[PDB]
Amino acid sequence: MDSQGRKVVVCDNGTGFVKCGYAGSNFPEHIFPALVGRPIIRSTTKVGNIEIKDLMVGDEASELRSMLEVNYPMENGIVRNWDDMKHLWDYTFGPEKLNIDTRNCKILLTEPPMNPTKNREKIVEVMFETYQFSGVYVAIQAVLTLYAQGLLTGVVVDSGDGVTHICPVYEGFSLPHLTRRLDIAGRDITRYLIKLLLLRGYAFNHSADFETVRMIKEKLCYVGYNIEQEQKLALETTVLVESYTLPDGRIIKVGGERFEAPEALFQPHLINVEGVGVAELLFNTIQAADIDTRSEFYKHIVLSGGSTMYPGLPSRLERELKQLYLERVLKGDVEKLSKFKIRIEDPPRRKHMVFLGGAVLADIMKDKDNFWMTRQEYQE
Amino acid sequence: TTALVCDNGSGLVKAGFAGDDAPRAVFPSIVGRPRHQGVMVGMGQKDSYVGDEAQSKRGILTLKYPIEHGIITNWDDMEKIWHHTFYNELRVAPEEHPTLLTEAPLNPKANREKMTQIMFETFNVPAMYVAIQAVLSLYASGRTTGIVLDSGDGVTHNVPIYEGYALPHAIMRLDLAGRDLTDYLMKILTERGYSFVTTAEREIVRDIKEKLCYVALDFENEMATAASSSSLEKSYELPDGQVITIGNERFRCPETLFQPSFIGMESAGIHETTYNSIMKCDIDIRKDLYANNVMSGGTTMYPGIADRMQKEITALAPSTMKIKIIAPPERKYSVWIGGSILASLSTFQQMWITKQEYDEAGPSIVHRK
Amino acid sequence: TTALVCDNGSGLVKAGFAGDDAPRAVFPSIVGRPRHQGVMVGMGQKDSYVGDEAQSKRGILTLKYPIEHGIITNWDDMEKIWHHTFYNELRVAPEEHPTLLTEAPLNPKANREKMTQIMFETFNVPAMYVAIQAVLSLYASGRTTGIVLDSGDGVTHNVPIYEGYALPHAIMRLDLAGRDLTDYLMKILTERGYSFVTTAEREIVRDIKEKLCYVALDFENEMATAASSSSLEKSYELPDGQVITIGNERFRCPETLFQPSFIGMESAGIHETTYNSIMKCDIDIRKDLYANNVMSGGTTMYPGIADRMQKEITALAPSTMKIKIIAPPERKYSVWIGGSILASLSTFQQMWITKQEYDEAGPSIVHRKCF
Ligand SMILES: Nc1ncnc2c1ncn2[C@@H]1O[C@H](COP(=O)(O)OP(=O)(O)O)[C@@H](O)[C@H]1O
Ligand SMILES: Nc1ncnc2c1ncn2[C@@H]1O[C@H](COP(=O)(O)OP(=O)(O)O)[C@@H](O)[C@H]1O
Ligand SMILES: Nc1ncnc2c1ncn2[C@@H]1O[C@H](COP(=O)(O)OP(=O)(O)O)[C@@H](O)[C@H]1O
Ligand SMILES: [Mg+2]
Numbered sequence A: 001m002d003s004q005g006r007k008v009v010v011c012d013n014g015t016g017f018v019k020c021g022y023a024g025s026n027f028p029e030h031i032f033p034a035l036v037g038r039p040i041i042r043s044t045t046k047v048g049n050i051e052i053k054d055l056m057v058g059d060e061a062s063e064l065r066s067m068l069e070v071n072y073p074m075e076n077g078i079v080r081n082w083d084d085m086k087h088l089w090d091y092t093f094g095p096e097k098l099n100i101d102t103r104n105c106k107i108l109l110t111e112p113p114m115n116p117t118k119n120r121e122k123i124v125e126v127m128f129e130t131y132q133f134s135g136v137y138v139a140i141q142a143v144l145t146l147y148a149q150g151l152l153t154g155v156v157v158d159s160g161d162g163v164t165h166i167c168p169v170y171e172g173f174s175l176p177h178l179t180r181r182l183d184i185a186g187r188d189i190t191r192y193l194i195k196l197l198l199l200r201g202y203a204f205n206h207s208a209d210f211e212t213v214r215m216i217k218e219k220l221c222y223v224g225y226n227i228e229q230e231q232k233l234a235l236e237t238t239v240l241v242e243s244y245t246l247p248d249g250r251i252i253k254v255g256g257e258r259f260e261a262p263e264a265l266f267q268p269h270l271i272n273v274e275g276v277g278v279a280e281l282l283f284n285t286i287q288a289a290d291i292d293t294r295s296e297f298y299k300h301i302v303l304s305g306g307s308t309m310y311p312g313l314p315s316r317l318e319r320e321l322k323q324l325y326l327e328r329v330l331k332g333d334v335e336k337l338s339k340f341k342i343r344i345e346d347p348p349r350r351k352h353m354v355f356l357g358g359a360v361l362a363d364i365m366k367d368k369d370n371f372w373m374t375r376q377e378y379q380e
Numbered sequence B: 001t002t003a004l005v006c007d008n009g010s011g012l013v014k015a016g017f018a019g020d021d022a023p024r025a026v027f028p029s030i031v032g033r034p035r036h037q038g039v040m041v042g043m044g045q046k047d048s049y050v051g052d053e054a055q056s057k058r059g060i061l062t063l064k065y066p067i068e069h070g071i072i073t074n075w076d077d078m079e080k081i082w083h084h085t086f087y088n089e090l091r092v093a094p095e096e097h098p099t100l101l102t103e104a105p106l107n108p109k110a111n112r113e114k115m116t117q118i119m120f121e122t123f124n125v126p127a128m129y130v131a132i133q134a135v136l137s138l139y140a141s142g143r144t145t146g147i148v149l150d151s152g153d154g155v156t157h158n159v160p161i162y163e164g165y166a167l168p169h170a171i172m173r174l175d176l177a178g179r180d181l182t183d184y185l186m187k188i189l190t191e192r193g194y195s196f197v198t199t200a201e202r203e204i205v206r207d208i209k210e211k212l213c214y215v216a217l218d219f220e221n222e223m224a225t226a227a228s229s230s231s232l233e234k235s236y237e238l239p240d241g242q243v244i245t246i247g248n249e250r251f252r253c254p255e256t257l258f259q260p261s262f263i264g265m266e267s268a269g270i271h272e273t274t275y276n277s278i279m280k281c282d283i284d285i286r287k288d289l290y291a292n293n294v295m296s297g298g299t300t301m302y303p304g305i306a307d308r309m310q311k312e313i314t315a316l317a318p319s320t321m322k323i324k325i326i327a328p329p330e331r332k333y334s335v336w337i338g339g340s341i342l343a344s345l346s347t348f349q350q351m352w353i354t355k356q357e358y359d360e361a362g363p364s365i366v367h368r369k
Numbered sequence C: 001t002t003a004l005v006c007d008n009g010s011g012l013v014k015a016g017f018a019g020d021d022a023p024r025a026v027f028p029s030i031v032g033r034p035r036h037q038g039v040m041v042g043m044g045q046k047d048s049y050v051g052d053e054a055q056s057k058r059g060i061l062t063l064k065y066p067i068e069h070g071i072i073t074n075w076d077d078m079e080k081i082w083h084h085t086f087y088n089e090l091r092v093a094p095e096e097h098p099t100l101l102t103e104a105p106l107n108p109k110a111n112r113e114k115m116t117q118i119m120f121e122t123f124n125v126p127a128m129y130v131a132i133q134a135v136l137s138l139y140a141s142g143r144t145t146g147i148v149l150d151s152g153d154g155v156t157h158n159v160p161i162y163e164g165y166a167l168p169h170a171i172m173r174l175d176l177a178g179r180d181l182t183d184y185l186m187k188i189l190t191e192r193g194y195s196f197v198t199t200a201e202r203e204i205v206r207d208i209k210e211k212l213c214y215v216a217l218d219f220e221n222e223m224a225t226a227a228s229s230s231s232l233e234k235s236y237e238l239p240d241g242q243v244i245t246i247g248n249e250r251f252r253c254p255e256t257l258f259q260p261s262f263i264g265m266e267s268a269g270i271h272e273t274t275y276n277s278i279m280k281c282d283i284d285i286r287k288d289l290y291a292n293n294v295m296s297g298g299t300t301m302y303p304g305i306a307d308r309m310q311k312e313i314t315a316l317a318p319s320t321m322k323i324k325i326i327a328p329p330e331r332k333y334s335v336w337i338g339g340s341i342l343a344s345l346s347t348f349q350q351m352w353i354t355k356q357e358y359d360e361a362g363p364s365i366v367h368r369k370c371f
């Protein structure tokens, strides 16, 4: 906390998960999904004595979803319904979790890079015009993961729920003309996994189903390291077929879908996104930087966010960057590739390295002047 | 107590104490400023970088040389390089050391004045002096007569001296130098489809120039052999591991010294301008100048330049007499070494402009010593 | 027979017959391949589409440009565009027509060597030539002295010419052109939320650019004006009736010609690049170049670019003298017109490269004749 006793909260409002705790913490308090829901009756599902409020939010909405219409208040990093985001924030700072007296707190937000303009304006508005925070800041996803890693140079590959961004930073200088956006991220892999499970004869269509298939994804999916050998394995032998139990108790069998779905990150056309995959799109970012910065960028690829957690993604991403470098820079000098120094920073804590980065930054700058936007400087 | 000798080259500053035989610091005469906004706490975020520091951070800097063609074009940056030199390289308070500076011939006199104002008013040096670079070079070579061909990063000039008497009327100056060879190398590399357009990338083309280029002994034979057997090609490795290869560019580049119509200026090459400086001297002196043709400065470091120089002059001068191109190994530092000698001599100690004399007479005293 | 003129532009291929006043074919220099494997039969008729059919069908097609930054990058596709030009647009058997091609300055040498080989070995032309695009602009301007600013789809370059002599050391090149202005427009619209990304959809941003962009005559005053009134905002109807809106993005887009730092270039802007080339010519020449700025190539069509250029150079140059920007309306076709002029002159007919010369000199001949 601050010297004035003011609590210094740090708060990621991802399209997937809220991740919100106090500065200087090594762990986030209170991970919960950015979800809002409303009670409905279904003729096919049991009703009981569990009290469902006229509106439910967050964790409770996600676990009671079987009797709720459910909505994600934010998509692609953009607020869709400000009313549901107000409810989600009201839950975040509410008695359920961080029971803070907001009028006395300092709050560190984050905003995705190259996001729409009026999105940020209305976020900063509500912090001073409804919660009355004593100070605000809007940090950048790229620099925060670098603070959590302690670095000053790297290329961040932040692959959240809604969208994936590559952002070079060199010796603390930003390189915003090199920022690259890839439209594939964890929400679309889940839409894609549904479309594949439909081909095995299952069905998933209700709003409550979207969260269930997300948990199937998180449990079973993995990035194939060498896609030819994964296809050979599925065709030659049955070992990939792994069961799952839906909340209705129906057993499903999941097979080669386990690696076909994540593969959209490396072959975007599989979900009708035109472009090149995350490995090539990253490489085309390094090769656009000034010639001598390139050899540092290859030594500090930094992964962040939950859609990097697929088993094998760093290993696969190394392989493609090496193949791209051998093909396009070394022109096939396969002996000379042995001199190529490449490091993919894959900390296991990387799922929360953005919030961890904010907790570092806010602890370094808890009481300084030019950092926090004060409510005294607001409304002018 | 010791004198301080400081050769402000157009490319490399070279500074060190007198009475020793090599510069104590050599570093590039470069200042750089951040090209991008800094966005993290606890980075250096200095408003400028100097010398080897700027050269390391090069990837995010615009690089500027305060000197162009031997003229100091931005004094605000030039004092910054001197400040870095005294306090960080030599780690010495200049308020206690008399300092010997260097300048090219045929140079705007406001340069010498303003340079001397800076020394006495900003660095409070007890005394100072300004020496002609080509005259210093003879001290390092250990002789009292010769025609000196300096070619630095920014300027080329010829000064004949006989028995210690200079011939000011025979001085010839030519602003073709290592910079123009670098920009020209950048241009011709595009014929192979490389590109090096930024100010940072020019430092890589300089490093290619320093490492691969050589002067053709007979230019049309090198062109004919390159275009046929192509055994002349050499590779080079970029900072990112890309390998380029370059061929007849290795010798088309320094050939500009002999055929400056490559860059398009109509002047004579370094050979024929050297010959003209001799032919402007009196008849009796000409014999001794051919015998002591002294090369100096880093642009004369190209392999084969001493050989090509002798070939060219011998085609021009009467065949009845010997021509000897003196080119020591240390010719990069002959200017600085000459200052270390001159400042050490017991006979020189009266020639410093003292602070008392400057206070009585202002910057114009540099024209009188 | 009469010669063809075929300006292998980075953006639009412009072709026709020598002596005509305007090209009988203009079409986009794109090659398209189908996104989706699922052909039917008879329909789904080709592996690839070239030129105007690849614009028309573009929603199903990944589009690639065979020319990037004025250097030929995919020769198989570039050959396809030449084949399309002669056999489909002009409907000419090229084996009996001399063809004048064009090139940008300071290209790789290997580019034009490969180019001349294909003409003599695939189209087996009788004769051809490879003129510099900037030199051709003075023919269309009907003059023999002046500095040509040509800025196309892929390259911006300056060639100064005095009394009929080029000054090859003052030539300057800057790889900003209509491509990069479109990618920047495609970037800045994300501030509104208008994502595009698709290579097909880049062709829509390209059309948005052409129809709404302009150059501010004082960038910072217009920026502060756009903060105050809606007056600059102009809407545009996408092909599906979604109407986007664009404000200060209209002029920030072409402004990066003058502030290349917007897209991370280290170069000086096009005005200062022009001025630096004049200050690289001899003192007696400069007096004439200032009077005879000739703008050429597509991106010079932006409204106000003539006025902004004229304003900027007169602030750098000595004030004691007239600076005038020549900018005819047909300056988009200047290079094709200048080719058609050159190929018509009787004095030119002696300097064709011919098959009988190529057969003995090989492809290197182009480095010997075409200067
Ligand atoms: N173990 C896992 N493996 C792969 N993907 C995961 C895993 N856990 C969560 N995800 C995915 O990552 C996202 C979790 O949210 P998060 O990574 O915090 O994104 P954001 O911060 O952008 O909201 C969801 O899209 C989810 O599908
Ligand atoms: N071995 C070499 N071969 C060719 N050129 C060189 C070599 N070493 C240095 N140079 C060039 O000479 C210049 C530096 O020489 P220097 O005598 O220090 O110039 P100055 O003294 O005028 O600063 C630079 O242009 C550098 O590229
Ligand atoms: N009316 C217009 N206003 C501004 N730019 C235009 C206009 N029309 C075309 N352009 C630009 O001109 C470029 C084409 O330049 P052009 O000279 O026709 O092709 P090339 O340079 O390949 O010969 C296109 O990229 C387009 O963006
Ligand atoms: Mg996230």
Ligand SMILES: [Mg+2]
Pocket: B008, B009, B010, B151, B152, B153, B297, B335
């Ligand atoms: Mg020097």
Ligand SMILES: [Mg+2]
Pocket: C009, C010, C151, C152, C153, C297, C298, C335
């Ligand atoms: Mg053009």
